Task: inverse folding
């Protein structure tokens, strides 16, 4: 316990406290339980009140740290379900690339933290538990908690705000030293002459101890580099704790999930990691442990990642005096790579963007999406936005955004001449073309018959119809346009009654997960001038039915 | 002054909206503001026993203002406080030849907020890189942006305004959340003089008001009309037939079959089909039908207003406000006149604000927007040009209009 001010905790509106069964357990367990229980009553963590309390929560006794020392713990489920909500314990973690080099860093893990914070008095009656002697044929003893019980709903957040309040006085007396908080740890940084930093660490330790919170009195901090939340934090660099990529013959769903996870985790500091073909496999079905054979593309991606990974790479820490740069490169199949740095020799961090949605995608729209994702990330990590280095020409961009149907904001950015440059590969005409043949295209299919036709009729009197198997109304609508393109000169006007086809083509896509649309793309790139116009049905549409 | 008690809608729980991350500049601006406000009594730090949260933002009109996003608390309380304390919306305001908008939010900060309710005004100044827990406050006074605030204050406001309303029986005055809309049929000079009189009168009774005059005489539904050319082609006929077919969804008496028969044989787009007398008959009758308004178009006050926006290039935007599809209640166009001093998101923000103002003057409600913009882009940048105390509901469209110049 401690003279800390408790936080008031009420139960959920109109709820009663737990009144749960206590089935007797092994006699050995009961013995060890009474031993540790009366030992922590002596320390004021729990008291013993028998008569009037009608509440009860079950206790269990196990041995996970077999120090000839059992462990009591309480299933606080039914109580947790009945206690109010709290301020959400901090969701997320600080990324190392937003940390600033401090001349010295100490880590302090607070011992038995929750048990050292008092619990609001009028709530303690709701933590009562019982110990039976002989199959309940002889009564038992009943206790309750005076402190934050292990794994209760309010324990972590109440602990956090108690800790913050205990820190405030020391922080006021020590503006030059910096203390970040995490579940049980303090991370204390300073730019003081090392002797002063050590004296300050002992001052903070004695402060905490006088507030009831113990701290490692040894050569305390597991020294740098620090193994923190899957990270190596080195005095002047950070990286990820090494990632072992297993070599196996067969692969389960769970194992591919673990592999894709380790790879994306690695991708924040290892440049060039791809996961497209790895995760394409899991995206297939919702099977939980089905044996998925590895594919050819997935295996080359795994080889390339394995070759990136067996060599060490690190990141630098943030310096607010030196500005912030983000640079973007394309890879292929809607995969993009990027780096955040302040100097071009060492990165603050790296990352990948994947066009997830949209089967009819565009290189420039994707690049925009990547600039957006980076911008959000930088607002989170550093509190400002990068200056961007982008493989796109200014005329290209100014042309795209001015004609695009959405509104799109483009921060301060500088063109970089590194291939593969990002361009637009074709542009439809704004008005029909004089002296160019006009193709009235249309196509049709049957839902149940699954056969279809696609054709065109031209002003020169040219007509074609082509049959197709296992196609849809939409696929033949695009096939009719593809026919018009195939059979036309370098300037062609095309007329379709398919608003879906007009929508697809007018989206100026660069690649698709659809062979037909890629062939239309290659045709449109090949053509010199193409005006595409739309009309409704009910022309040549009736002849291809 | 004791507190008006605030009982939420039964079974409703409080707002639990996550806070957005902000740049360092705006976090510092919020820290400054809130330290002053805590010093003045207006807010107080809170414990973990308070699980609610409501986003905050920093906007600007030269120094930083804090803007709380109370949309969730609004729906969660004031859907019972448009009922228990509603402010009637004068249907006359829309007809006044001029309307000026005075900010009077600073009034609320004198009035204590009900004890039992303060917990639900909690907000969090966030922290960069998750490095520190976030600073947690709740209001002890009526917050700006909450719809309950002007509801509670309207008694005081009616009293304060009574002398001016006696002196000026024709001026219309409507209070929406933090602003008075003041409508008159005076000359802009006399109107601005009378606005200044109201300003000094509000100040005589201790209402500060800081320191841009809108005119609701616009056409209700801007009627879209087909182009007028001195020569027509096959493709011109095709665009004209297409634009006339889509209007058949709205004015059903669109009589176009003489035009479909006017392009009968397979011709090249650039060929010019002459103007048939049948064809000109159809065209004139259809222009005539376009001159008239729609039938059955009314304002259902039980439902919600819906606004849609289309980008038209060269800084032009078109919008429609409706409640059922094709039954437009108002249509218009916005155009930001500043070359390279405006960009797309600046324009969209200004347009959303103009549409919301119009919507308030006309109906007392604001519309839910269908914004043509990537969700995350707007979530990142909408504050950079936002100059309003309220915040409309909105959502994000991903299908483009293949109908662009069908609106202008
Ligand atoms: N475990 C742990 C842990 C977890 C976190 Cl999250 C941070 C942490 O240290 C820091 C604490 C406060 C700091 O202040 S703030 O202005 O960023 C800066 C900090 O060190 C970051 C850079 N670093 C690190 C090690 C070193 O040997 N030398 C350095 O320079 C330790």
Result:
């Amino acid at each position: 316990i401690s003279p800390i001010e408790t936080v008031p905790v009420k139960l959920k509106p109109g709820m009663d406290g737990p009144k749960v069964k206590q089935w007797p357990l092994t006699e050995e367990k009961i013995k060890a339980l009474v031993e540790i229980c009366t030992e922590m009553e002596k320390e004021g963590k729990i008291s013993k009140i028998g008569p009037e309390n009608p509440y009860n929560t079950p206790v269990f006794a196990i041995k996970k740290k077999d120090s000839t020392k059992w462990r009591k713990l309480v299933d606080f489920r039914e109580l947790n379900k009945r206690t109010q909500d709290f301020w959400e314990v901090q969701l997320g973690i600080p990324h190392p690339a937003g940390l600033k080099k401090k001349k010295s860093v100490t880590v302090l893990d607070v011992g038995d933290a929750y048990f050292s914070v008092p619990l609001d008095e009028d709530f303690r009656k709701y933590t009562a538990f019982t110990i039976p002697s002989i199959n309940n044929e002889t009564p038992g003893i009943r206790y309750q908690y005076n402190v934050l019980p292990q794994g209760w709903k309010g324990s972590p957040a109440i602990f956090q705000s108690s800790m913050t309040k205990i820190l405030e006085p020391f922080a006021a007396q020590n503006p030059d030293i910096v203390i970040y908080q995490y579940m049980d740890d303090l991370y204390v940084g300073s730019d003081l002459e090392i002797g002063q930093h050590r004296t300050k660490i002992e001052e903070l330790r004695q402060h905490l101890l006088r507030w009831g919170l113990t701290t490692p009195d040894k050569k305390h901090q597991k020294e740098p580099p620090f193994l923190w939340m899957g990270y190596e934090l080195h005095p002047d660099k950070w990286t990820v704790q090494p990632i072992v990529l297993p070599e196996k013959d067969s692969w389960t769903v769970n194992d591919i999930q673990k592999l894709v996870g380790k790879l994306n985790w690695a991708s924040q500091i290892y440049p060039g990691i791809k996961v497209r073909q790895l995760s394409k496999l899991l995206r297939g079905t919702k099977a939980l442990t089905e044996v998925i054979p590895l594919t050819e593309e997935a295996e080359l991606e795994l080889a390339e990642n394995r070759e990136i990974l067996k060599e060490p790479v690190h990141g630098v820490y943030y310096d607010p005096s030196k500005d912030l740069i983000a640079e973007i490169q394309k890879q292929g199949q809607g995969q993009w790579t990027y780096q955040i740095y302040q100097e071009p020799f060492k990165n603050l961090k790296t990352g990948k963007y994947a066009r997830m949605r949209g089967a009819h995608t565009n290189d420039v729209k994707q690049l925009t999406e990547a600039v957006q994702k980076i911008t959000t990330e930088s607002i989170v990590i550093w509190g400002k936005t990068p200056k961007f280095k982008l493989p796109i020409q200014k005329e290209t961009w100014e042309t795209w955004w001015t004609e695009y149907w959405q509104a799109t904001w483009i921060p301060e950015w500088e063109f970089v001449n590194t291939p593969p440059l990002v361009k637009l590969w074709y542009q439809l005409e704004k008005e029909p073309i004089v002296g160019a043949e006009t193709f009235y295209v249309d196509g049709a299919a049957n839902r149940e018959t699954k056969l279809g036709k696609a054709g065109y009729v031209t002003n020169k009197g040219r007509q074609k119809v082509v049959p197709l198997t296992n196609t849809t109304n939409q696929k033949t609508e695009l096939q009719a346009i593809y026919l018009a393109l195939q059979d036309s000169g370098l300037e062609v006007n095309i007329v379709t009654d398919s608003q879906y086809a007009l929508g697809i083509i007018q989206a100026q896509p660069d690649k698709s997960e659809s062979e037909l649309v890629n062939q239309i793309i290659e045709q449109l790139i090949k053509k010199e001038k193409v005006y595409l116009a739309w009309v409704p049905a009910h022309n040549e549409q009736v002849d291809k039915l | 002054i004791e507190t008006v008690p605030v009982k939420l809608k039964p079974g409703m729980d409080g707002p639990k909206v996550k806070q957005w991350p902000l740049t360092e500049e705006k976090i510092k601006a919020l820290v400054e503001i809130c330290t002053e406000m805590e010093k003045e009594g207006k807010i107080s730090k809170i414990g973990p026993e308070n699980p609610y949260n409501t986003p905050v933002f920093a906007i600007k009109s030269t120094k930083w203002r804090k803007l709380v996003d109370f949309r969730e608390l609004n729906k969660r309380t004031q859907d019972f406080w448009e009922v228990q304390l509603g402010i009637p919306h004068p249907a006359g305001l829309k007809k006044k030849k001029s309307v000026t908008v005075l900010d009077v939010g600073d009034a609320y900060f004198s009035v204590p907020l009900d004890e039992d309710f303060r917990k639900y005004t909690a907000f969090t100044i966030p922290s960069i890189n998750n490095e520190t827990p976030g600073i947690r406050y709740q209001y002890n006074v009526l917050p700006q942006g909450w719809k309950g605030s002007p509801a509670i204050f309207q008694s005081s406001m009616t009293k304060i305004l009574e002398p001016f309303k006696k002196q000026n029986p024709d001026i219309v005055i409507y209070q929406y959340m933090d602003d008075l809309y003041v409508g008159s049929d005076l000359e802009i000079g006399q109107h601005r003089t009378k606005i200044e009189e109201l300003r000094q009168h509000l100040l005589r009774w201790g209402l500060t008001t800081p320191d841009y005059e809108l005119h609701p005489d616009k056409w209700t539904v801007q009627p879209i009309v087909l182009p007028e050319k001195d020569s027509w082609t096959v493709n011109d006929i095709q665009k004209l037939v297409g634009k006339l077919n889509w209007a058949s969804q709205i004015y059903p008496g669109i009589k176009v079959r003489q035009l479909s028969k006017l392009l009968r044989g397979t011709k090249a787009l650039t060929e010019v089909i002459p103007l048939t007398e049948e064809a000109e008959l159809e065209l004139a009758e259809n222009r005539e039908i376009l001159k008239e308004p729609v039938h059955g178009v009314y304002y259902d006050p039980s439902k919600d207003l819906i606004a849609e926006i289309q980008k038209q290039g060269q800084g032009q935007w078109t919008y429609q406000i409706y409640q059922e599809p094709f039954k437009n209640l108002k249509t218009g166009k916005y155009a930001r006149m500043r070359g390279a001093h405006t960009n797309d998101v600046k324009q969209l923000t200004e347009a959303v604000q103009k549409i919301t103002t119009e919507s308030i003057v006309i109906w007392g409600k604001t519309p839910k927007f269908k914004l043509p913009i990537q969700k995350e882009t707007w979530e990142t940048w909408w504050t950079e040009y936002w100059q309003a105390t309220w915040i409309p509901e909105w959502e994000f469209v991903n299908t483009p209009p293949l109908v662009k110049l069908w609106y202008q």
Summary: The radius of gyration of chain A is 33 Å. Chain A touches chain B through 73 residues (CB under 8 Å). Residues 426-545 of chain A form one domain. The first strand of chain A starts at residue 46 and ends at 48.
